[PDB]
Write a protein that binds this DNA or RNA. Sequence first.
RNA 1: UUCAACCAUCAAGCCCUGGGCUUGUGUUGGGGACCCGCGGCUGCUCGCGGGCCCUGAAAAGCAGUGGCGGGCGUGCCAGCCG
Lengths: 23, 152, 267, 254, 41, 192, 49, 154
Amino acid sequence: GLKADEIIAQRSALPAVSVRKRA
Amino acid sequence: SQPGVMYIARLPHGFYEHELRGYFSQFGEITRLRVVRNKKTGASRHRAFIEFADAEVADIAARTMDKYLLFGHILTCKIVPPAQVHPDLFKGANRRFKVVPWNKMAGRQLERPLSESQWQVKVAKEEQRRAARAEKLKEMGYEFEAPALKVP
Amino acid sequence: IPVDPDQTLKACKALLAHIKKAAAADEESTVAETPIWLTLTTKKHIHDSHRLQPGKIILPHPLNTSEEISVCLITADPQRFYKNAVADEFPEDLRAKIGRVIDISHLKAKFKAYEAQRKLFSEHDVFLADTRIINRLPKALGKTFYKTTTKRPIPVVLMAQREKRDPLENANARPIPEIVAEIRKAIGAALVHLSPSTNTAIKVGYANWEPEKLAANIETVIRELVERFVPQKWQNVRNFYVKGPETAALPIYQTDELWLDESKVVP
Amino acid sequence: ALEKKISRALGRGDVSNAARLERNANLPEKTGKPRYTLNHIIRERYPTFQDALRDLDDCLSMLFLFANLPSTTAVPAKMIARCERLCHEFQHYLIVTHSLRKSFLSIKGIYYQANIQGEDILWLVPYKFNQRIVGDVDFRIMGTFVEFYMTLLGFVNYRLYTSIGLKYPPKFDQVKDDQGAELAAFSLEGLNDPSQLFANFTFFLSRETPRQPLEFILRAFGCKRIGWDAVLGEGAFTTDESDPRITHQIIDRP
Amino acid sequence: SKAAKGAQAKKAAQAALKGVHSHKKTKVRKSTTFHRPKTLV
Amino acid sequence: FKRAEKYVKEYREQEREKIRLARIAKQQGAKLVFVIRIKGINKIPPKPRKILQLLRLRQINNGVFVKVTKATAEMIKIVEPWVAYGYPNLKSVRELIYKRGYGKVNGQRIPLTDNAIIEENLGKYGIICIEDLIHEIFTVGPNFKQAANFLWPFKLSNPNGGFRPRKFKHFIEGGDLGNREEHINALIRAMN
Amino acid sequence: RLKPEGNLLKDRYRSMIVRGKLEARRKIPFRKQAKTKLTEKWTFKDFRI
Amino acid sequence: QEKKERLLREATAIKEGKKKEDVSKKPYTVKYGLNHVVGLIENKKASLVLIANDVDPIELVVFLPALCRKMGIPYAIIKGKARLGTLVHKKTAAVVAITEVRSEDKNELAKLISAVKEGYLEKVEDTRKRWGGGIMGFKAQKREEKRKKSLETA
RNA sequence: UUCAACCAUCAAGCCCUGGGCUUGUGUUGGGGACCCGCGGCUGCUCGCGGGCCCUGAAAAGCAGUGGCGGGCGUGCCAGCCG
């Protein structure tokens, strides 16, 4: 992959918060 | 009073001596300036040192221009302390860094005529190099019969 | 030609034996994928400047014939025409070999960054380039593709032979079988790179080959190289060597005259 | 209000919306026509066509003058081209009805007198030279007069062509216009004795002679074969000066 | 002077970080009375 | 205050111009053209600047007539980034000379209000009227050089000045380099 | 070699005034500007470095 | 107009018996709408968040830097809800986000994200925790300067 | 107080009817191993040009060679050549 892709996709270790299950 | 030295890196292509002098003379007058360059090519190494006449003028310029996004480069503008200013940092400053065609001078080295004595010492060296290559090749099981260099 | 073919065959056999003996100390995979280099040493610089478009020498035993070789083809706009041509009216071996088709506009759009150029450099073995846009590829591909002569874009002719052309309505292309023949020829051809230097290196084969095929390729490369790309022809030719990437150089031709002509000898 | 909306679109960066809204402005610099339509004003000002014919003197003097002026913001170049087009159409009507009566070469310009439906019409046309716009005149209000008079002359031309049973507007050849045909770029088509003084002659105009008044007067008084030097424009009967069919040649060279 | 040098450096920094449109026109009002503007009826 | 990005952009423009001029000089290698000075880059190198001075294209919207020869073709190639040029038609030449024609007498700009000015300044060449001047210019005669030197550079107008939302906009956008052929006549018609 | 005399545009303007369709007015080259005071914006006053 | 043209092309494809995805490609847009952007931040889809500085009521965005910091999203406060509205064809926009761009702009987006992190977030890392306001008026400031000068003199 | 785009998306010339050849000069900077070719250097080494990897458009003195013109012998040229 690309370092640019890593920088764009970088997030924190906290899991995502979802209102509901999505299709 | 004391001069201030700023190290600037991540220079985009085009941010060279005249551009840097003109841009940072807006902040304050510049005593010395040098872009670090390759001697074989003349090409910039994307870093330079600027010595401003006045220290907090240098500090203001560095804090203004640090992390500035310029032609895809996030600039690095830092103040170097006078203790770690090298005594020979601005050797070659405020002058052109010429682009010298070493390769073209090498081609003309091959091009121009030489005398009989010069061809003689070249022939002697060429025999020595062939002999050296010969006993190096003798380990690999290869034999090449080189024709004799006819002397001029 | 002054080059003795028996001595060339002896050099090929000795070099192959030495490469095998060095690789023995997978063994077969190490012997394979080891290129054989022909080295030409001249008396003057072979060229005045760096020429970034390689010359092609056609071989009796073509290179890049392995099926694992990936080929990227860089064309003029549009890329859709050539992509459809590869997908529809190409032979299956070339369809499997061609791993990417991209036009110059998409190349300038998506591969301006140096890391993108390095990724594209790593993803393929051989790059072919249409002669309509090949003079723009040093700027689009940078020193990533042109500091080294190994993967420089090889010229191919895709233009139809006799305002601003609109790519969508007309592609201005020669017929597809002619494109296929040109691509196959350029993939197989040996490459000559002209630099202001006394040293030119040409890849003529691999270490897993046979010495007879290696010597035949060396002979035709020597003939075409001295005839086409060497100024003053055999008068400028000083030395000829055959070598592997980590081996020493075996001289196959060496000269008796160390000067260009009698004008170099002055008293 | 439309100009405010266009300014909003340009200031927000909506170039497509700005172009689309600008098409509703009907600017003279792209249409060749006045920014506002004065058709309803024409009937209010002239209850009868006779009243329009009696104001034709001022109308024709102003429009023939402005056909030779440089482009300004008050009167753009396309509007000047429309002035020239309307004057040429009127001249073609006068030619085909043989309504021209008198002409005079004064020190100020060329006077023309015609008769249309019993009304004498006298107007003054400048000699073809560089016209000087001085600051002593109110040029923008002169441009407002030009807009009114071109609106009037369009309807006068339509009425005259329909009265003599010709299609209006006449066919116009832009290629011949670009090659310099002037009056010769028009083709008059049907819908759906002093007049024959020059009927038997063949005229050749030299380069130094004034082509547009000479062609207008000769064609109005019956000439059918007028040639000239090739630099004077397309539409000549002949270009070669050595044509044996030429009977008369106009010269002004010593 | 040192104050002038600092002022010049501050002005260049302000231009670099904010631009050059530092000033704004205001109406001169010779009366303390504000009148409602006349608008299109 | 000047921006660092303006400094970098100016350097890159000057470098690209130097490359283009060097390639023209390395390469080297009779119609009538109309040439209009348009806005380009702010800094002009010395050779294009001297050529613009010789062609009297110092000011924006100046127009001149040029006879295409080898030297003039090379000159036009050199100053291509600052000009728009093409082949003017007979209507364009006639309308330019009649509506915006000025003569150079005693180093002064004199409008061509009469034939007598042309007779005193060009009568030694046989040019005694405006129509003779037009003939020499359009047919590119032997005395084209004297006719074009007598003609002052044409000051063309900017149609965008008629519209307030687009008031500051230049009429001819830069970038469309090369010969415009007969499409210079649209520009001449719009600006004359 | 005729030297044309007068100015036809000026003649038409004079004819308009004489016949009374409009009154004679002079050109105003400069209009009086609104009296304004220059002041520095709050953000540029409050800028610190 | 662009949507109308796209829907006409898709209707043509449906008429000739093709799916709309055959004639339409995947879109890449600036994401906007406050509820939508808050959802993208919570799902960790947003790559860059720009928040207007002048949202009234301020409570609509006052939690946004804390939310972005918890989710590890690069954010910046930018001047102009009207300026963001010009991006999204509206009069005003409280917040905009970028999730993904095209391949030719991926490098530009990554450079912009690094520039935001190094030139905005690190510079405001300490100043964002401070109390604002408390500035004195002009006459009061001069009064306290005179009072302090008199106290120092006496 | 605009960080856009803009080379040849083919031309010209040879062979003289074959679709081939020639010219059109255009590359970010660093780092690591390591096989060579040729120039000097007593020689090491230093140059010039290739071969193999690494890298966000990354960066912390080490600057090194001779002249024409131009500017005031010259750590000066948004000018060239060597």
